[PDB]
Amino acid sequence: TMRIAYAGLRRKEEFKALAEKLGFTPLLFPVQATEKVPVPEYRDQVRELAQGVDLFLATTGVGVRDLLEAGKALGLDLEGPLAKAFRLARGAKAARALKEAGLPPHAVGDGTSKSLLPLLPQGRGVAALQLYGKPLPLLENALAERGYRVLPLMPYRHLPDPEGILRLEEAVLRGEVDALAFVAAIQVEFLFEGAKDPKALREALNTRVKALAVGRVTADALREWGVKPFYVDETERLGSLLQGFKRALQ
């Protein structure tokens, strides 16, 4: 019996059906509140960024593209200020987006926030931080340490389901799950941030429980929290994640 916990919000019925088709026991453990809250002040944050900053930290390709488009849509010069700024990309996707904008990063990480820490210079003025639904305490705390005021930039807010998060952590730590499928990096992050014992959670997912990730970006978030993903699907198709898992077992 392979008992796979599904952390996603959508495609619950689809996950359950595919699990039983492949001989697994599906368990539903969502970790987010539903759904996208708009951040009304986006737009004002982008206006503030155009006033000029000392550092720009990009986390996602989509987020860089959104920001630059909003800038142009709002009649602002962002390229000016961003070309003078020291520029960091957390991973390859954020780096590609900046490179395509003629603003290639000065420092690129490995997809994890922690890889940026030794690459952050000291240390004055404003660090614009582009963001994908939630605060990034490790990065934000480090930027304060380095001497920067943080200017957060994100169009939408994602919220955790704290009770949901605790139920999933309990289920894992009580040995009631064999594998854990995350379909978004935000799920990984909410789980570990909201867990009572993130360290025990990590050791469990590295030994007895197999962490499954939809896409490299989700796998990046597991690696941030010290988890080696058991399997990572590059297709973003649930049947493919689950067949891939069934295959790797071995």
Question: Main attributes?
Answer:
250 residues; 2 domains; 19% strand; elongated; lyase; heme biosynthesis
Global shape:
elongated
Care to count the β-strands? 12
The amount of beta strand, in percent, is 15-25%
CATH architecture of the largest domain: 3-Layer(aba) Sandwich
- Main sheet attributes: strand count, strand direction, barrel closure: 5 strands, parallel
- Helicity range: 40-55%
Could you spell the SSE succession in H and E letters? Answer: EHEEHEHHEHEEHEEHEHHEHEH
Keywords: Lyase
Enzyme class: lyase
Domain Tetrapyrrole biosynthesis uroporphyrinogen III synthase: 14-243
Protein name: Uroporphyrinogen-III synthase
Protein architecture, described:
The protein has eleven helices and twelve strands. With 250 residues, the protein is an alpha/beta fold. Strands 2-1-10-11-12 form a five-stranded parallel beta sheet, sandwiched between helices. Helix 5 links the parallel strand 5 and strand 6. Helix 3 (61-73) runs parallel beside helix 5 (92-100), helix 7 (162-173) packs across helix 8 (185-194) and helix 8 runs parallel beside helix 10. It is elongated, with a radius of gyration of 19 Å. The protein starts with a strand and ends with a helix. One of its GO terms (molecular function) is uroporphyrinogen-III synthase activity. Pfam families: HEM4. Its EC number is 4.2.1.75.
Quick structural gist:
Pfam families: HEM4. By secondary structure, the chain is α/β, with parallel strands linked by helices.
